[PDB]
Amino acid sequence: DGYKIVCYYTNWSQYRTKIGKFMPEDIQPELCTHIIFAFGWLKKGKLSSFESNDETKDGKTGLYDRINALKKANPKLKTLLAIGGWSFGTQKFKEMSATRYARQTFIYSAIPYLRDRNFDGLDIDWEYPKGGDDKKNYVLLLKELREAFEAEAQEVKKPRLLLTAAVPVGPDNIKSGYDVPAVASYLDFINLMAYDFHGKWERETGHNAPLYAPSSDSEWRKQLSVDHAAHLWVKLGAPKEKLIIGMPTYGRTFTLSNPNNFKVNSPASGGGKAGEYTKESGFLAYYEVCEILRNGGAYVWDDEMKVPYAIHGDQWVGFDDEKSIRNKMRWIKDNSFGGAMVWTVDMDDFSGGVCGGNVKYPLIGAMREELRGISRGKDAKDVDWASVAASV
Protein backbone atom coordinates (compact mmCIF):
# COMPACT_ATOMS: atom_id res chain seq x y z
CA ASP A 1 0.00 0.00 0.00
CA GLY A 2 1.05 3.58 -0.71
CA TYR A 3 3.89 5.02 -2.77
CA LYS A 4 6.79 2.73 -3.62
CA ILE A 5 10.44 3.42 -2.88
CA VAL A 6 12.26 1.19 -5.36
CA CYS A 7 16.02 1.23 -4.75
CA TYR A 8 18.62 -0.15 -7.15
CA TYR A 9 21.64 -1.82 -5.53
CA THR A 10 24.68 -2.38 -7.74
CA ASN A 11 27.11 -5.20 -6.98
CA TRP A 12 30.16 -3.50 -8.50
CA SER A 13 29.80 -0.87 -5.77
CA GLN A 14 31.49 -3.50 -3.60
CA TYR A 15 34.76 -2.61 -5.33
CA ARG A 16 34.78 1.10 -4.43
CA THR A 17 37.47 2.50 -2.14
CA LYS A 18 37.22 4.54 1.04
CA ILE A 19 34.16 6.77 1.22
CA GLY A 20 33.03 4.94 -1.91
CA LYS A 21 32.98 1.47 -0.33
CA PHE A 22 29.48 0.00 -0.07
CA MET A 23 28.04 -3.28 1.20
CA PRO A 24 24.45 -4.63 1.46
CA GLU A 25 24.56 -4.10 5.24
CA ASP A 26 24.90 -0.35 4.60
CA ILE A 27 21.27 -0.44 3.48
CA GLN A 28 18.67 0.32 6.15
CA PRO A 29 15.97 -2.41 5.98
CA GLU A 30 13.22 0.22 6.27
CA LEU A 31 14.68 2.61 3.68
CA CYS A 32 13.01 1.10 0.62
CA THR A 33 9.84 -0.82 -0.17
CA HIS A 34 11.76 -2.63 -2.90
CA ILE A 35 15.40 -3.46 -3.57
CA ILE A 36 16.53 -4.43 -7.07
CA PHE A 37 19.80 -6.33 -7.42
CA ALA A 38 21.83 -5.17 -10.42
CA PHE A 39 22.63 -7.32 -12.05
CA GLY A 40 22.00 -10.95 -12.82
CA TRP A 41 23.34 -12.36 -16.07
CA LEU A 42 22.66 -14.73 -18.96
CA LYS A 43 24.46 -18.07 -19.43
CA LYS A 44 23.52 -20.40 -22.24
CA GLY A 45 20.21 -18.57 -22.60
CA LYS A 46 19.44 -19.03 -18.90
CA LEU A 47 19.27 -16.77 -15.85
CA SER A 48 22.54 -16.88 -13.91
CA SER A 49 24.98 -14.93 -11.74
CA PHE A 50 27.25 -12.10 -12.85
CA GLU A 51 30.03 -13.73 -10.85
CA SER A 52 30.61 -16.14 -7.95
CA ASN A 53 30.70 -13.31 -5.39
CA ASP A 54 26.93 -12.95 -5.74
CA GLU A 55 26.41 -16.63 -4.96
CA THR A 56 26.78 -18.35 -1.58
CA LYS A 57 29.39 -21.12 -1.55
CA ASP A 58 31.45 -23.05 1.03
CA GLY A 59 30.08 -21.24 4.07
CA LYS A 60 30.94 -17.93 2.42
CA THR A 61 27.79 -15.81 2.15
CA GLY A 62 27.22 -14.10 -1.20
CA LEU A 63 25.76 -10.69 -2.03
CA TYR A 64 22.38 -12.21 -2.92
CA ASP A 65 21.86 -13.60 0.58
CA ARG A 66 23.29 -10.48 2.22
CA ILE A 67 20.78 -8.33 0.34
CA ASN A 68 17.89 -10.70 1.10
CA ALA A 69 18.86 -10.89 4.79
CA LEU A 70 17.47 -7.37 5.15
CA LYS A 71 14.02 -8.94 4.87
CA LYS A 72 14.56 -10.56 8.27
CA ALA A 73 14.58 -7.11 9.87
CA ASN A 74 11.91 -5.83 7.44
CA PRO A 75 9.56 -8.61 6.28
CA LYS A 76 7.57 -6.08 4.38
CA LEU A 77 10.59 -5.56 2.03
CA LYS A 78 10.56 -6.91 -1.53
CA THR A 79 13.60 -7.85 -3.53
CA LEU A 80 13.93 -8.37 -7.28
CA LEU A 81 16.77 -9.55 -9.51
CA ALA A 82 17.52 -7.36 -12.51
CA ILE A 83 18.85 -8.69 -15.80
CA GLY A 84 20.35 -6.36 -18.39
CA GLY A 85 21.99 -2.98 -17.97
CA TRP A 86 24.65 -1.18 -20.00
CA SER A 87 27.30 -3.92 -19.95
CA PHE A 88 24.79 -6.63 -20.87
CA GLY A 89 24.08 -5.09 -24.27
CA THR A 90 21.31 -6.01 -26.69
CA GLN A 91 22.35 -9.17 -28.54
CA LYS A 92 21.66 -11.63 -25.70
CA PHE A 93 18.16 -10.18 -25.31
CA LYS A 94 17.59 -10.42 -29.07
CA GLU A 95 18.60 -14.08 -28.98
CA MET A 96 16.56 -14.76 -25.84
CA SER A 97 13.31 -13.23 -27.19
CA ALA A 98 13.62 -14.20 -30.89
CA THR A 99 11.80 -17.56 -30.63
CA ARG A 100 9.39 -19.20 -28.20
CA TYR A 101 11.92 -21.92 -27.35
CA ALA A 102 14.56 -19.41 -26.21
CA ARG A 103 12.01 -17.38 -24.25
CA GLN A 104 10.55 -20.45 -22.51
CA THR A 105 14.07 -21.70 -21.77
CA PHE A 106 14.93 -18.41 -20.08
CA ILE A 107 11.62 -18.25 -18.18
CA TYR A 108 11.76 -21.78 -16.80
CA SER A 109 15.38 -21.17 -15.87
CA ALA A 110 14.38 -17.92 -14.19
CA ILE A 111 11.59 -19.20 -11.94
CA PRO A 112 13.66 -21.68 -9.89
CA TYR A 113 16.70 -19.37 -9.94
CA LEU A 114 14.61 -16.69 -8.22
CA ARG A 115 12.80 -19.03 -5.83
CA ASP A 116 15.94 -20.86 -4.65
CA ARG A 117 17.63 -17.54 -3.82
CA ASN A 118 14.65 -15.89 -2.10
CA PHE A 119 14.04 -13.19 -4.72
CA ASP A 120 10.50 -11.83 -4.96
CA GLY A 121 10.68 -10.86 -8.63
CA LEU A 122 12.47 -10.17 -11.90
CA ASP A 123 13.42 -6.80 -13.40
CA ILE A 124 14.02 -6.56 -17.16
CA ASP A 125 16.65 -3.96 -18.08
CA TRP A 126 16.98 -4.31 -21.86
CA GLU A 127 18.93 -1.30 -23.13
CA TYR A 128 17.29 -1.12 -25.47
CA PRO A 129 14.84 -2.99 -27.71
CA LYS A 130 14.97 -1.41 -31.17
CA GLY A 131 13.02 -2.10 -34.37
CA GLY A 132 9.79 -3.97 -35.06
CA ASP A 133 11.18 -7.41 -34.25
CA ASP A 134 12.52 -6.30 -30.87
CA LYS A 135 9.30 -4.36 -30.30
CA LYS A 136 7.08 -7.43 -30.79
CA ASN A 137 9.44 -9.96 -29.14
CA TYR A 138 9.94 -7.84 -26.01
CA VAL A 139 6.17 -7.90 -25.54
CA LEU A 140 6.13 -11.66 -26.12
CA LEU A 141 8.87 -12.07 -23.49
CA LEU A 142 7.06 -9.99 -20.86
CA LYS A 143 3.77 -11.73 -21.70
CA GLU A 144 5.07 -15.29 -21.38
CA LEU A 145 7.08 -14.39 -18.27
CA ARG A 146 3.94 -12.92 -16.71
CA GLU A 147 1.72 -15.90 -17.55
CA ALA A 148 4.34 -18.34 -16.23
CA PHE A 149 4.61 -16.36 -12.99
CA GLU A 150 0.82 -16.31 -12.66
CA ALA A 151 0.61 -20.09 -13.17
CA GLU A 152 3.52 -20.93 -10.86
CA ALA A 153 2.08 -18.78 -8.08
CA GLN A 154 -1.17 -20.77 -8.06
CA GLU A 155 0.58 -24.13 -8.35
CA VAL A 156 3.10 -23.68 -5.50
CA LYS A 157 0.75 -21.54 -3.38
CA LYS A 158 3.16 -18.65 -2.82
CA PRO A 159 2.92 -14.89 -3.47
CA ARG A 160 3.43 -14.30 -7.20
CA LEU A 161 6.87 -13.35 -8.49
CA LEU A 162 6.84 -9.70 -9.56
CA LEU A 163 7.68 -8.71 -13.13
CA THR A 164 9.06 -5.23 -13.70
CA ALA A 165 11.22 -3.39 -16.23
CA ALA A 166 13.52 -0.38 -16.49
CA VAL A 167 12.41 1.82 -19.37
CA PRO A 168 13.96 4.87 -21.14
CA VAL A 169 12.78 8.48 -21.36
CA GLY A 170 13.95 9.21 -24.90
CA PRO A 171 10.99 9.61 -27.31
CA ASP A 172 12.82 7.87 -30.17
CA ASN A 173 13.88 4.91 -28.01
CA ILE A 174 10.33 4.58 -26.67
CA LYS A 175 8.77 4.78 -30.14
CA SER A 176 11.28 2.37 -31.68
CA GLY A 177 11.30 -0.37 -29.06
CA TYR A 178 8.23 -0.13 -26.83
CA ASP A 179 4.66 -1.27 -27.43
CA VAL A 180 3.52 0.67 -24.36
CA PRO A 181 -0.03 -0.70 -23.81
CA ALA A 182 0.96 -4.39 -23.82
CA VAL A 183 4.24 -3.74 -21.98
CA ALA A 184 2.44 -1.83 -19.22
CA SER A 185 -0.30 -4.47 -19.05
CA TYR A 186 2.15 -7.34 -18.52
CA LEU A 187 4.33 -5.59 -15.92
CA ASP A 188 3.48 -5.17 -12.24
CA PHE A 189 5.16 -1.77 -12.25
CA ILE A 190 7.38 0.36 -14.47
CA ASN A 191 10.78 1.74 -13.47
CA LEU A 192 11.10 4.92 -15.52
CA MET A 193 14.79 5.73 -15.99
CA ALA A 194 14.28 9.47 -15.45
CA TYR A 195 17.96 10.33 -15.85
CA ASP A 196 20.75 10.57 -18.45
CA PHE A 197 18.65 13.18 -20.25
CA HIS A 198 21.93 14.95 -20.99
CA GLY A 199 25.61 14.08 -20.77
CA LYS A 200 29.08 14.28 -22.31
CA TRP A 201 27.71 12.85 -25.57
CA GLU A 202 26.34 16.38 -26.03
CA ARG A 203 28.22 19.53 -27.05
CA GLU A 204 26.66 21.82 -24.51
CA THR A 205 25.97 21.50 -20.82
CA GLY A 206 22.67 19.88 -19.93
CA HIS A 207 21.15 18.59 -16.71
CA ASN A 208 21.10 14.87 -15.92
CA ALA A 209 17.42 14.93 -14.96
CA PRO A 210 15.63 18.27 -15.42
CA LEU A 211 12.03 18.20 -14.17
CA TYR A 212 11.16 20.78 -16.80
CA ALA A 213 13.25 21.65 -19.86
CA PRO A 214 15.12 25.00 -19.83
CA SER A 215 13.77 27.71 -22.19
CA SER A 216 17.13 27.68 -24.01
CA ASP A 217 16.32 24.15 -25.34
CA SER A 218 15.25 23.73 -28.96
CA GLU A 219 11.76 22.37 -29.55
CA TRP A 220 13.20 18.88 -29.97
CA ARG A 221 15.27 19.04 -26.77
CA LYS A 222 12.31 20.22 -24.71
CA GLN A 223 11.05 16.63 -24.87
CA LEU A 224 13.99 15.74 -22.64
CA SER A 225 12.51 16.31 -19.19
CA VAL A 226 11.10 14.09 -16.45
CA ASP A 227 7.64 15.65 -16.74
CA HIS A 228 7.41 15.24 -20.52
CA ALA A 229 8.76 11.68 -20.41
CA ALA A 230 6.41 10.50 -17.67
CA HIS A 231 3.39 12.12 -19.31
CA LEU A 232 4.53 10.61 -22.61
CA TRP A 233 4.45 7.15 -21.05
CA VAL A 234 0.97 7.88 -19.70
CA LYS A 235 -0.16 9.11 -23.13
CA LEU A 236 1.04 5.89 -24.76
CA GLY A 237 -1.02 3.61 -22.52
CA ALA A 238 0.85 3.22 -19.23
CA PRO A 239 -1.27 3.59 -16.08
CA LYS A 240 -0.04 6.42 -13.83
CA GLU A 241 0.14 4.26 -10.70
CA LYS A 242 2.45 1.80 -12.47
CA LEU A 243 5.00 4.47 -13.36
CA ILE A 244 7.74 4.59 -10.74
CA ILE A 245 9.76 7.71 -11.47
CA GLY A 246 13.54 7.44 -11.48
CA MET A 247 15.72 9.59 -9.25
CA PRO A 248 19.51 9.78 -9.69
CA THR A 249 21.86 9.84 -6.72
CA TYR A 250 24.39 10.87 -9.34
CA GLY A 251 25.13 13.81 -11.62
CA ARG A 252 26.33 14.31 -15.18
CA THR A 253 29.49 16.34 -15.73
CA PHE A 254 31.03 18.52 -18.44
CA THR A 255 34.20 20.52 -18.90
CA LEU A 256 33.32 24.09 -19.89
CA SER A 257 34.94 25.53 -23.01
CA ASN A 258 34.98 28.78 -21.05
CA PRO A 259 34.66 28.88 -17.23
CA ASN A 260 32.86 32.24 -17.54
CA ASN A 261 30.03 30.67 -19.54
CA PHE A 262 28.66 28.26 -16.94
CA LYS A 263 24.88 28.33 -17.36
CA VAL A 264 22.84 25.46 -18.80
CA ASN A 265 23.29 25.01 -22.57
CA SER A 266 26.79 26.50 -22.44
CA PRO A 267 29.51 25.18 -24.81
CA ALA A 268 31.49 22.23 -23.45
CA SER A 269 34.71 20.62 -24.68
CA GLY A 270 33.75 17.21 -23.31
CA GLY A 271 32.95 15.31 -20.14
CA GLY A 272 33.91 16.45 -16.66
CA LYS A 273 37.01 15.03 -15.01
CA ALA A 274 36.53 11.67 -13.30
CA GLY A 275 35.79 11.40 -9.58
CA GLU A 276 37.99 9.63 -7.05
CA TYR A 277 35.52 6.86 -6.25
CA THR A 278 33.40 6.30 -9.36
CA LYS A 279 36.40 6.81 -11.65
CA GLU A 280 34.41 7.70 -14.78
CA SER A 281 34.62 10.83 -16.93
CA GLY A 282 31.24 12.51 -17.35
CA PHE A 283 29.86 10.95 -14.17
CA LEU A 284 29.80 11.73 -10.45
CA ALA A 285 28.21 10.16 -7.38
CA TYR A 286 26.16 12.48 -5.15
CA TYR A 287 28.73 12.41 -2.33
CA GLU A 288 31.46 13.45 -4.78
CA VAL A 289 29.32 16.44 -5.75
CA CYS A 290 28.97 17.10 -2.02
CA GLU A 291 32.77 17.01 -1.71
CA ILE A 292 32.98 19.58 -4.51
CA LEU A 293 30.39 21.85 -2.88
CA ARG A 294 32.21 21.75 0.47
CA ASN A 295 35.54 22.65 -1.15
CA GLY A 296 35.05 25.84 -3.15
CA GLY A 297 32.33 24.75 -5.57
CA ALA A 298 29.59 27.15 -6.63
CA TYR A 299 25.90 26.24 -6.35
CA VAL A 300 23.25 27.25 -8.88
CA TRP A 301 19.54 26.52 -8.56
CA ASP A 302 17.80 26.47 -11.93
CA ASP A 303 14.20 27.41 -11.19
CA GLU A 304 13.05 26.64 -14.72
CA MET A 305 14.34 23.08 -14.56
CA LYS A 306 13.74 22.92 -10.79
CA VAL A 307 17.20 21.37 -10.40
CA PRO A 308 20.72 22.35 -9.26
CA TYR A 309 24.10 22.37 -10.93
CA ALA A 310 27.51 22.93 -9.35
CA ILE A 311 30.47 24.80 -10.85
CA HIS A 312 34.13 24.46 -9.90
CA GLY A 313 36.52 26.12 -12.34
CA ASP A 314 35.67 24.65 -15.73
CA GLN A 315 33.96 21.65 -14.11
CA TRP A 316 30.18 21.69 -14.49
CA VAL A 317 27.92 19.11 -12.85
CA GLY A 318 24.16 18.82 -13.22
CA PHE A 319 22.78 16.95 -10.21
CA ASP A 320 19.90 16.40 -7.78
CA ASP A 321 19.82 17.58 -4.17
CA GLU A 322 17.33 17.30 -1.30
CA LYS A 323 15.49 20.38 -2.60
CA SER A 324 15.02 19.12 -6.17
CA ILE A 325 14.26 15.62 -4.89
CA ARG A 326 11.53 16.87 -2.54
CA ASN A 327 10.07 19.02 -5.32
CA LYS A 328 10.06 15.93 -7.54
CA MET A 329 8.26 13.96 -4.83
CA ARG A 330 5.61 16.68 -4.69
CA TRP A 331 5.41 16.47 -8.50
CA ILE A 332 5.00 12.68 -8.23
CA LYS A 333 2.14 13.03 -5.76
CA ASP A 334 0.52 15.78 -7.83
CA ASN A 335 0.59 13.57 -10.92
CA SER A 336 -0.61 10.42 -9.12
CA PHE A 337 2.39 8.29 -10.10
CA GLY A 338 3.21 5.05 -8.30
CA GLY A 339 6.30 6.24 -6.46
CA ALA A 340 10.02 6.90 -6.71
CA MET A 341 12.78 4.69 -8.09
CA VAL A 342 16.44 5.31 -7.19
CA TRP A 343 19.68 4.90 -9.12
CA THR A 344 21.36 4.15 -6.95
CA VAL A 345 21.20 3.38 -3.23
CA ASP A 346 25.00 3.17 -3.08
CA MET A 347 25.67 6.67 -4.39
CA ASP A 348 23.56 8.53 -1.85
CA ASP A 349 25.33 9.86 1.24
CA PHE A 350 24.80 6.46 2.87
CA SER A 351 27.34 6.96 5.67
CA GLY A 352 25.90 10.37 6.50
CA GLY A 353 29.32 11.94 6.98
CA VAL A 354 30.15 13.42 3.58
CA CYS A 355 27.58 16.10 2.73
CA GLY A 356 27.53 17.82 6.13
CA GLY A 357 23.94 17.39 7.28
CA ASN A 358 24.88 14.32 9.32
CA VAL A 359 21.97 12.38 7.82
CA LYS A 360 22.34 8.87 6.42
CA TYR A 361 20.68 8.63 3.00
CA PRO A 362 19.53 12.28 2.83
CA LEU A 363 18.07 11.99 -0.69
CA ILE A 364 16.31 8.62 -0.43
CA GLY A 365 15.34 9.54 3.12
CA ALA A 366 13.73 12.67 1.71
CA MET A 367 11.88 10.55 -0.84
CA ARG A 368 10.58 8.19 1.84
CA GLU A 369 9.65 11.22 3.96
CA GLU A 370 7.66 13.04 1.29
CA LEU A 371 5.98 9.93 -0.12
CA ARG A 372 5.47 7.74 2.94
CA GLY A 373 5.54 10.16 5.90
CA ILE A 374 8.54 8.60 7.61
CA SER A 375 10.84 11.10 9.20
CA ARG A 376 14.60 10.95 8.56
CA GLY A 377 15.05 11.82 12.22
CA LYS A 378 14.62 14.53 14.83
CA ASP A 379 17.30 16.98 13.84
CA ALA A 380 17.60 15.86 10.23
CA LYS A 381 17.75 19.03 8.14
CA ASP A 382 18.49 19.36 4.43
CA VAL A 383 21.76 20.97 3.40
CA ASP A 384 21.09 24.52 2.22
CA TRP A 385 23.82 24.62 -0.44
CA ALA A 386 23.01 28.20 -1.44
CA SER A 387 24.25 29.24 2.00
CA VAL A 388 26.89 26.53 2.46
CA ALA A 389 28.59 26.80 -0.94
CA ALA A 390 29.86 29.71 -3.03
CA SER A 391 27.72 31.73 -5.43
CA VAL A 392 28.46 32.64 -9.04
From TrEMBL:
Disulfide pairings: C7-C32, C290-C355
Superkingdom, taxonomy of origin: Eukaryota
Ranges for domain GH18: 3-374
Family the entry assigns: Belongs to the glycosyl hydrolase 18 family. Chitinase class II subfamily.
Name the record gives this protein: Chitinase
Organism of this sequence: Ostrinia furnacalis
Upper classification of the organism: Eukaryota, Metazoa, Ecdysozoa, Arthropoda, Hexapoda
Residues of the full protein shown: 91 to 482 of 987
